[PDB]
């Protein structure tokens, strides 16, 4: 289906073989087979292919080697809070001619820029990545929409899949069907939440490799999706800067209108009901222990905050008050008594420079996008860890 | 290295195209000869 | 007037004769010939 | 961008039109109407494309068709002889006015 | 009841500068944007710009760039207009208007909902 | 394809050829 | 042919398979076939091949990034013979050492250079490419002779050609012959005129 005037999706899905016929209905019957999805080989192939696609897509684009210079920076917002992350900066670019240096200005985010070494609280600034590695901006034709991908085995091999609805990732499946190609899974890049994923069929599934070891990561597969809105409201403008012979740089030029906070919106009642049912499914795995929903442990901004992208811009959302409250008893929230329209709103921040996959991949400077960004999504699953404290004899924390 | 890539593609395509109908003749069991007697009646709709 | 710019318009002048086809060496016909069984 | 004058007997309805571009009228419903008696401050009449503020009677109503909008005055009296203005968000945090219409109640 | 006390009449020569006060009353002043409207005599309204009372962020018409500045403080609930280098056409009636409600999550500063009006003031250029 | 994977060896004697029919298809 | 003397022809013709024997001149007879030389796939394939070979041959050669500097130029052909077209220019090259800049001169043609913008009609000059993209010089071992190229279909496919002496270019040919490989067409780069083509 993904064949149009545009072929430069970052996952390069146009080059794949088109699946002409219907998907196979090849149920076997009288077949039992043991499965271990924590030992599956295909996930490592998927991770390697995503890394290789990222490298081969970011390879021919424009580099940012000459831009890493001394930056003289000052305040950009007239405020003193909320949206104070904007800063203004000036520098010296190189024109087409080598001997002609030109004074230039650009706007930046506060997480992108770093005050220079041995500063006397001065205006001297630099980029974050300049003492780590190089960086390349993304080409503006590149579209980051998660087009679905069907993995297929070669001829002479086969793909067996489980059909048992309560299959929690281990154990033998009574209902096993073969198929030529996998279904339309999506390469959605996110952390701490699953977006646009395949829904659980009838029951909220908890998958963990050991369930008592806290080093294992609990995968929570929700039965019903939770719809989430995310937006950056303020009107951004894109400017262009000539750097070197025949290649251009893009940056944030100006903001039009009153600046408002980038945020996300979640229906609070459905989220609490989902957390309540997850607490039911977890307390039936951990009897006589009240669980607690608490914020994640402290660490990096990319690790603590829920990170994703919609459009070409990248979002990092606070989510501390999202994971709040304790579930005890049996269905204590009672859903609701009235027609509540309560929406929990998460504040979010935006980075331009990302060292995605923890530096295994490559640096990218995401170019800014004019206008505004709005994006809608379904939360279908959660990534949780068991904070197994000593005083958790009855009050467990996740 | 462009011409080498094309030669590799050509040889792979030739091997596949030769093996396909040989596999079909092996399925029909009359492989190894150029003319096959089939024991299948010719339907009148084709006639 | 003289024209140009697309180089394949040069090359179409040299490849006008040739055409590529695929050989399909299997054929179906009736003969009223029964296989020995 | 507004007709200069309009006339009408008391009791009958009239309409006041305003026509702009796609940028100011076509894109958004953020269009307002105001009235102003001579020697008086302008007065708050219509805020949304159709919505009336509290305290505003059923004399007036808002409407929009494509690239234009109109204030329909349902019935008339002499007190509606004031000047009328239309106003609109014009994009890029800019606010413009249509220009005016003198209502001549007969 | 909400009302905006504008300042008195200003009579001065061309090339001078005018500061006009607007003292808000009846509501918490941080809640709503402040716009200002000019009106030439025998002529309709004229928009200059707006100011965010929460943070002092302001915007202008393109022909009023540089000549105008806006300030405010919610400590005494007032906002000060300042027009510099006046011309002969700048003789007008000036109006303080309450804009829409100030939100945190959407740009409502461009909303043309001028709910309440000041009494007006006269700026006359001799 | 593999339509008699759970059946006896007598039953697979009807199906087995179509398994070979998928050994090179695509 | 003996291309081992210079394997650095730009069309890389040494890597191709040598056509040792005589071609297959098998005329079919009693065969009519429709042809369309505006819908032929092979011309787009070989245009892509020429582009790919150009990029492949040009890739390891030397770049001209340090050359894009300020040029101070003068009339080198004041004694013009109604040709002129020849500007003397001077600039600052970079030597082997990074810190040692060296004053240098070169001659250029007038279409190659452009008077630098924001000047007072002075001698400030630059290259044409410097606001578009970089360029690389051709390696001096590279020979641009149009060596003939035969295209061959893979085994299991076939090439049919029209034997008709008055072919329109589209439509049916009464006389069609098969062949394993095409004749020696030449990849001559030219516009507005066809050079040394098949008559
Ligand atoms: C993500 O989620 C967040 C959080 O949920 C979202 O942020 C929220 O977005 C809401 C958008 O509607 C916004 O709601 C606004 O609140 C304003 C202030 O609310 C307080 O006052 C009202 C009324 O007193 C209370 O009900 C409320 O509980 C609060 O106490 C309201 O003032 C806004 O309503 C007005 O604006 C809209 C838009 O113009 C009008 O359509 C509406 O009719 C209201 O208009 C009246 O008021 C304006 C301003 O004065 C007048 O210009 C207008 O003429 C109306 O006047 C009234 O009064 C006059 C008096 O004479 C009368 O004549 C007339 O008839 C009217 O009665 C609006 O409702 C939330 O504040 C905001 N934040 C939070 C924390 O919730 C965010 O949008 C989400 N984002 C995404 C992308 O999903
Ligand atoms: C989970 O799944 C949802 C569902 O698809 C995803 O949401 C989509 O996100 C993409 C990217 O954020 C959205 O695509 C963009 O939509 C903009 C608005 O589109 C509406 O308006 C236009 C104009 O009227 C209509 O044609 C269109 O049909 C919609 O009605 C467009 O303006 C954007 O186009 C611009 O960007 C592209 C690429 O950058 C350019 O090629 C264009 O020329 C143009 O500049 C763009 O198409 C999409 O609309 C969203 N769909 C929904 C239903 O919300 C989520 O992103 C996904 N979750 C995650 C994490 O990815
Ligand atoms: C294009 O322009 C360039 C830039 O000027 C030009 O290069 C110049 O060429 C001339 C000769 O072709 C060079 O002049 C010589 O320079 C050497 C060393 O500098 C001198 O020793 C030479 O003789 C001098 O000394 C003698 C003994 O004292 C004297 O008897 C004599 O009169 C001289 O004073 C001679 O001048 C010149 O150095 C270069 N300059 C540069 C920067 O390269 C080039 O020739 C021009 N091309 C054309 C086709 O005109
Ligand atoms: C997030 O979850 C939503 C529900 O929780 C999904 O919304 C549903 O998506 C279905 C498929 O996209 C829609 O079904 C389609 O409806 C249209 C119009 O009714 C029909 O023409 C289609 O035939 C039908 N297709 C199918 C396969 O059923 C649902 O109408 C729609 N809404 C509801 C309330 O169920 C979202 O798709 C899902 N994903 C995202 C990205 O939002
Ligand atoms: C971020 O900082 C830069 C650096 O000062 C700002 O750029 C400056 O922008 C102003 C107007 O926006 C420029 O003033 C104009 O100068 C021209 C002549 O250059 C003059 O003709 C105009 O009348 C006007 O005075 C100024 O030159 C420019 N400076 C530089 C170095 O570019 C930029 O505006 C700041 N960003 C924000 C959002 O404030
Ligand atoms: C490249 O430069 C960056 C910028 O300075 C370096 O990152 C810095 O690393 C130090 C060491 O971890 C961080 O200091 C830490 O601060 C926290 C408090 O925030 C404190 O609790 C720790 O004990 C430690 O002192 C510093 O914050 C961090 N700065 C930024 C902006 O991330 C980076 O290490 C440099 N890399 C190389 C290879 O030189
Ligand atoms: C899944 O988790 C359970 C518990 O969370 C793991 O059982 C634990 O296994 C370790 C290593 O076999 C035991 O440690 C050893 O304990 C003995 C005394 O019990 C001590 O003398 C040794 O030096 C060593 O530390 C640990 O006691 C045991 N805990 C329990 C409650 O059984 C289990 O191995 C995990 N399985 C997988 C596959 O991850
Ligand atoms: C830029 O921001 C504006 C303002 O927030 C966005 O406009 C809003 O887009 C949503 C899209 O879901 C609209 O909601 C829907 O509107 C339709 C009618 O247009 C209605 O039938 C639906 O029930 C639903 O309410 C919303 O009305 C609209 N608001 C305005 C004032 O136009 C816009 O989407 C953003 N654009 C980008 C590219 O981010
Ligand atoms: C967010 O910022 C963009 C960038 O400025 C805004 O787009 C601009 O909108 C104005 C209308 O207020 C456009 O001006 C109009 O242009 C047309 C044709 O150029 C002209 O005929 C009209 O008389 C008027 O001047 C402007 O062109 C347009 N710029 C771009 C690049 O699209 C956008 O309106 C802002 N968003 C919001 C919600 O205001
Ligand atoms: C084993 O799995 C298959 C497929 O996952 C099931 O077949 C489906 O059965 C449902 C009703 O049970 C039908 O609505 C679907 O149409 C069937 N699928 C197809 C492709 O036809 C099968 O029922 C399962 N059997 C058991 C015992 O769990
Ligand atoms: C960009 O380059 C300019 C020069 O092209 C720098 O300006 C010089 O800064 C030094 C250090 O303060 C002064 O001594 C000089 O007088 C300045 N002017 C000139 C013409 O050399 C400037 O500092 C550089 N950086 C920025 C951010 O503008
Ligand atoms: C979420 O976890 C943090 C982990 O630090 C909790 O913070 C601790 O709370 C206990 C409560 O008795 C204190 O004794 C510790 O000193 C706290 N540690 C720190 C570093 O602050 C926090 O209370 C938890 N919140 C919820 C709602 O469970
Ligand atoms: C988790 O939710 C509780 C319940 O709302 C929060 O407790 C309230 O916190 C606010 C501000 O911190 C106070 O004004 C309320 O009085 C508190 N209510 C109660 C009943 O204690 C709590 O802060 C939330 N925690 C997190 C981390 O979001
Ligand atoms: C090449 O570099 C030389 C320096 O090595 C430049 O010569 C200088 O030019 C400036 C500008 O006119 C003068 O102020 C200096 O006095 C010159 N000499 C030195 C030693 O710096 C020269 O302009 C550059 N360009 C060309 C085309 O020669
Ligand atoms: C059809 O084409 C074939 C080959 O293009 C023609 O055969 C050639 O005929 C000429 C004389 O007519 C001989 O000199 C050549 O030697 C022949 N070719 C070969 C390979 O032997 C044939 O004559 C054509 N027939 C018609 C009716 O056009
Ligand atoms: C569910 O997972 C746990 C731990 O991964 C495992 O011990 C258990 O056997 C699984 N359940 C089934 C039915 O296989
Ligand atoms: C929301 O969920 C928490 C459990 O995480 C629960 O303690 C709390 O009571 C719920 N809120 C309501 C209003 O029921």
CA distances from A71 to A43, A90, A93 (A): 43, 6, 11
Interhelix angle B2-28/F9-21, nearest 10 degrees: 140
Which residue's CA is the nearest one to ligand 17's atom 9?
A333
Contacts of A156 in chain F (CB under 8 A): 23-24
Interchain proximity A246–G132, CB inside 8 Å: yes
Q: Residues of B near F (CB-CB distance < 8 A)?
A: 19-20, 23, 26-27
H or E element at residue A231? strand A218-242
Structure determination method = cryo-EM
CA distances from G176 to A52, C25, G167 (A): 48, 20, 11
Residues whose CB falls within 8 Å of the CB of residue G179, separated by 6 or more in sequence, listed in order: G23, G24, G25, G26, G159, G160, G161
Phi-psi sector, G39: left (phi>0), alpha (psi -120 to 50), beta? alpha
Contacts of F20 in chain A (CB under 8 A): none
**Ligand 2 binding pocket includes A170 (Cβ within 6 Å):** no
H or E element at residue A47? helix A42-58
Structure tokens belonging to residue G91: 């600039």
Contacts of A150 in chain F (CB under 8 A): none
Q: Is the CB of residue A366 less than 8 Å from the CB of residue A313?
A: yes
Ligand 17 atom with the smallest distance to the CA of A275 is 5
Report the alpha-carbon angle D59-D65-D66, nearest 5: 150
Q: How far apart are CA A346 and CA A369, in angstroms?
A: 22
SS3 G14: helix
Give strand ranges (E) for A262-365: 263-267, 290-293, 306-310, 313-317, 325-327, 343-351, 353-355, 363-365
CA distances from A379 to A208, A223, A259, A366, D9 (A): 19, 10, 28, 25, 61
Ligand 2 center to residue G152 CA distance, Å?
46
The number of C-beta contacts closer than 8 angstroms across B and C is 14
Which of E80, E28, E36 has the alpha carbon at shortest distance from E54? E28
Mutation test residue for ligand 8: of E103, E104, E106, E108, the one with most atoms within 8 Å of CB: E106
Contacts of A100 in chain G (CB under 8 A): 70
Interchain proximity F17–B27, CB inside 8 Å: yes
How close G123 comes to chain C (CA, Å)? 34
Q: How far apart are CA A272 and CA A285, in angstroms?
A: 20
**Number of residues that make up chain E:** 126
Give strand ranges (E) for chain G: 33-36, 71-75, 86-94, 101-109, 113-115, 124-127, 157-162, 170-173, 176-179
Interchain proximity C35–B37, CB inside 8 Å: yes
Q: How far apart are CA A244 and CA A92, in angstroms?
A: 12
> What are the φ and ψ backbone dihedral angles of A225, each rounded to 5 degrees?
-75, 155
Q: How far apart are CA A277 and CA A333, in angstroms?
A: 10
Ligand 13 atom with the smallest distance to the CA of A324 is 1
Which residue's CA is the nearest one to ligand 15's atom 1?
G175
**Ligand 15 binding pocket includes G143 (Cβ within 6 Å):** no
Which DSSP category does C36 fall into?
P
Ligand 13 center to residue A321 CA distance, Å?
9
Count of C-beta atoms within a 10 Å radius of residue E118: 22
How close G8 comes to chain B (CA, Å)? 13
| A abuts E (3+ Cβ pairs < 8 Å) | yes
Interchain proximity E113–D97, CB inside 8 Å: no
Distance of CA E46 to the CA centre of its chain: 11
Interchain proximity C8–G197, CB inside 8 Å: no
Q: How far apart are CA B27 and CA F18, in angstroms?
A: 9
This PDB structure is determined at a resolution in Å of: 4.3
Residues whose CB falls within 8 Å of the CB of residue A154, separated by 6 or more in sequence, listed in order: none
E42 CB burial (10 A radius; 0-12, 13-18, 19+): exposed
Structure tokens belonging to residue A1: 């289906």
Q: How far apart are CA E49 and CA E35, in angstroms?
A: 6
> What are the φ and ψ backbone dihedral angles of G121, each rounded to 5 degrees?
55, 40
The bridge status of strand A363-365 relative to strand A371-384 is: unpaired
Which member of E56, E59, E104 has the closest CB to residue A260? E104
Q: How far apart are CA A268 and CA C24, in angstroms?
A: 65
Ligand 10 atom with the smallest distance to the CA of A165 is 28
- Chains near E with 3+ CB pairs less than 8 A apart are A, D
Report the alpha-carbon angle A299-A303-A306, nearest 5: 130
Q: How far apart are CA A82 and CA E56, in angstroms?
A: 14
Ligand 7 atom with the smallest distance to the CA of A212 is 5
Contacts of D94 in chain E (CB under 8 A): 47, 59, 61-62, 110
Residues whose CB falls within 8 Å of the CB of residue A16, separated by 6 or more in sequence, listed in order: A149, A150
H or E element at residue B5? helix B2-28
Q: How far apart are CA G183 and CA G185, in angstroms?
A: 6
Collect contacts of A353-359 with beta carbons under 8 A, ≥24 apart: A353/A112, A353/A127, A353/A128, A353/A129, A353/A135, A354/A302, A354/A314, A355/A129, A355/A132, A355/A302, A356/A54, A356/A189, A357/A51, A359/A132, A359/A133
**Ligand 3 binding pocket includes G88 (Cβ within 6 Å):** yes
Q: Break chain G down into helix, strand, coil percent, rounded to 5.
A: 10, 30, 60
- Chains near G with 3+ CB pairs less than 8 A apart are A, B, C
Q: How far apart are CA A334 and CA G92, in angstroms?
A: 80
Interchain proximity B11–G156, CB inside 8 Å: no
Structure tokens belonging to residue D91: 């994009």
Q: How far apart are CA F3 and CA F26, in angstroms?
A: 18
Count of C-beta atoms within a 10 Å radius of residue E17: 13
Q: Is the CB of residue G16 less than 8 Å from the CB of residue G49?
A: no
SS3 G43: helix
In the block, residue with structure tokens 């829409």: E100
Which ligand has the minimum distance to the alpha carbon of residue G124? 14
Count of C-beta atoms within a 10 Å radius of residue G199: 3
Which DSSP category does E122 fall into?
E
Phi-psi sector, A329: left (phi>0), alpha (psi -120 to 50), beta? left
Nearest-10 Cα torsion for A316, A318, A323, A324: -170
Structure tokens belonging to residue A85: 């992350």
Selected for mutation to probe chain E from D42, D69, D91 (highest E CB count within 10 Å) is D42
Which member of C15, C22, C23 has the closest CB to residue G43? C15
Which ligand has the minimum distance to the alpha carbon of residue A122? 11
**Ligand 3 binding pocket includes G72 (Cβ within 6 Å):** no
Structure tokens belonging to residue A27: 């149920």
Give the residues across from B30 on adjacent strands: none
Selected for mutation to probe chain G from A246, A247, A248 (highest G CB count within 10 Å) is A246
**Ligand 17 binding pocket includes A275 (Cβ within 6 Å):** yes
Q: How far apart are CA A222 and CA A275, in angstroms?
A: 10
Contacts of C12 in chain G (CB under 8 A): 37-38, 40, 43
Q: How many helices (H) and strands (E) does chain A have?
A: 3, 24
Nearest-10 Cα torsion for A208, A210, A212, A213: -100
Contacts of F15 in chain B (CB under 8 A): none
Contacts of F24 in chain B (CB under 8 A): 19-20, 23
Q: How many helices (H) and strands (E) does chain E have?
A: 0, 10
> What are the φ and ψ backbone dihedral angles of G43, each rounded to 5 degrees?
-70, -35
Listed in sequence order, the DSSP H helices in chain G are: 42-58
Residues whose CB falls within 8 Å of the CB of residue G194, separated by 6 or more in sequence, listed in order: C10, C13, G188
Ligand 6 center to residue A318 CA distance, Å?
21
Phi-psi sector, E56: left (phi>0), alpha (psi -120 to 50), beta? left
Phi-psi sector, D11: left (phi>0), alpha (psi -120 to 50), beta? left
H or E element at residue F19? helix F9-21
Give the residues across from D15 on adjacent strands: D72
Which of A335, A199, A222 has the alpha carbon at shortest distance from A268? A335
**Ligand 17 binding pocket includes A327 (Cβ within 6 Å):** yes
Selected for mutation to probe chain D from A237, A255, A256, A371 (highest D CB count within 10 Å) is A256
Contacts of B47 in chain C (CB under 8 A): 30
DSSP string for residues in E33-84? EEEEEEE-TTS-EEEEEEE-TTT--EEE-GGGTTTEEEEEETTTTEEEEEEE
Q: How far apart are CA E112 and CA D96, in angstroms?
A: 9
Which residue's CA is the nearest one to ligand 8's atom 9?
A374
Q: How far apart are CA A308 and CA A185, in angstroms?
A: 17
Q: Is the CB of residue A207 less than 8 Å from the CB of residue A281?
A: no
Interface list for C 15-34 with B (CB within 8 A):
25-26, 30, 33-34
Q: How far apart are CA A278 and CA A275, in angstroms?
A: 5
How far does chain G reach from its first CA to its final CA, in angstroms? 23
């Amino acid at each position: 289906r993904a064949y149009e005037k545009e072929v430069h999706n970052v996952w390069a899905t146009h080059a794949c073989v088109p699946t002409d016929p219907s998907p196979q209905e090849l149920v076997l019957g009288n077949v039992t087979e043991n499965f271990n999805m924590w030992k599956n080989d295909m996930v490592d192939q998927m991770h390697e292919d995503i890394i290789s696609l990222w490298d081969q897509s970011l390879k021919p684009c424009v580099k940012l080697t000459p831009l890493c210079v001394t930056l003289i920076c000052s305040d950009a917002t007239v405020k003193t809070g909320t949206v104070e992350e904007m800063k203004n900066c000036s520098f010296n670019t190189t024109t087409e001619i080598r001997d002609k240096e030109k004074k230039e200005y650009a706007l930046f985010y506060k997480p992108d820029i770093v005050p220079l070494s041995e500063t006397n609280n001065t205006s001297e600034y630099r980029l974050i990545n300049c003492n780590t590695s190089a960086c390349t901006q993304a080409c503006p034709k590149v579209t980051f929409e998660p087009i679905p991908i069907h993995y297929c085995a070669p001829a002479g091999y086969a793909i067996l899949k489980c059909n048992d609805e309560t299959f929690n990732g281990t154990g033998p499946c009574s209902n096993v069907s073969t198929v030529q190609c996998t279904h339309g899974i999506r390469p959605v890049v996110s952390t701490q939440l699953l977006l646009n994923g395949s829904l659980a069929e009838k029951e909220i599934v908890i998958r963990s490799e050991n369930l008592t070891n806290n080093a294992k990561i609990i995968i929570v597969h929700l039965h019903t999706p939770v719809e989430i809105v995310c937006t950056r409201p303020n009107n951004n403008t894109r400017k262009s800067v000539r750097i070197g012979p025949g290649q251009t740089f893009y940056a944030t030029g100006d903001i039009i209108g009153d600046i408002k906070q980038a945020h996300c919106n979640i229906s609070e009642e459905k989220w609490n009901d989902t957390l309540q049912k997850v607490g039911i499914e977890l307390q039936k795995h951990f009897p006589n222990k009240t669980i607690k929903y608490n914020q994640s442990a402290g660490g990096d901004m990319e690790i603590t905050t829920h990170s994703f992208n919609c459009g070409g811009e990248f979002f990092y959302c606070n989510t501390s008050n999202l994971f709040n409250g304790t579930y005890n008893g049996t269905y204590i929230s009672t859903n609701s008594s009235a027609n509540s329209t309560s929406t929990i709103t998460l504040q979010c921040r935006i980075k331009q420079i990302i060292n995605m996959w923890q530096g295994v991949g490559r640096c990218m400077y995401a170019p800014p996008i004019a206008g505004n960004i709005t994006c809608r999504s379904n939360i279908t699953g959660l990534l949780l860890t068991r904070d197994g404290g000593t005083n958790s004899n009855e009050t467990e924390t996740f | 290295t462009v011409w080498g890539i094309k030669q590799l593609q050509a040889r792979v395509l030739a091997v596949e195209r030769y093996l396909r109908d040989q596999q079909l003749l092996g399925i029909w069991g009359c492989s190894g000869k150029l003319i096959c007697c089939t024991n299948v009646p010719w339907n009148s709709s084709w006639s | 007037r003289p024209a140009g710019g697309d180089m394949r318009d040069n090359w179409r002048s040299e490849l006008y004769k040739y055409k590529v086809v695929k050989i399909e060496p299997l054929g179906v016909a009736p003969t009223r010939c029964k296989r020995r069984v | 961008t507004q007709p200069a004058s309009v006339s009408g007997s008391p009791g009958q309805p009239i309409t006041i039109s305003c026509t702009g571009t796609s940028y100011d009228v076509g894109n958004y419903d953020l269009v307002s109407w105001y009235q102003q008696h001579p020697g008086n401050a302008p007065k708050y009449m219509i805020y949304e494309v159709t919505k009336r503020p509290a305290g505003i009677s059923n004399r007036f109503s808002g409407s929009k068709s494509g690239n234009t909008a109109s204030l329909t005055i349902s019935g008339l009296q002499a007190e509606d002889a004031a000047d009328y203005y239309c106003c609109s968000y014009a994009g890029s945090s800019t606010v413009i006015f249509g220009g005016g219409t003198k209502v001549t109640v007969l | 009841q909400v009302q905006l006390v504008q300042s008195g009449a200003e009579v001065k020569k061309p090339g001078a500068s005018v500061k006009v006060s607007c003292k808000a009353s009846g509501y918490r002043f941080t809640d709503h944007y402040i716009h200002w409207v000019r009106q030439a005599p025998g002529q309709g309204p004229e928009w200059m710009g707006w100011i965010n009372t929460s943070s002092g962020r302001s915007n202008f018409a393109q022909k009023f760039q540089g000549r105008v500045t806006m300030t405010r403080d919610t400590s005494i609930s007032t906002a000060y207009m300042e027009l510099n280098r006046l011309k002969s056409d700048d003789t007008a009636v000036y109006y303080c208007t309450t804009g829409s409600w100030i939100s945190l999550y959407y740009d409502s500063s461009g909303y043309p909902n001028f709910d309440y009006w000041g009494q007006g003031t006269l700026v006359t250029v001799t | 394809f593999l339509g008699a994977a759970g059946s006896t060896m007598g039953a697979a004697s009807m199906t087995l050829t179509v398994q070979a029919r998928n050994l090179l298809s695509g």
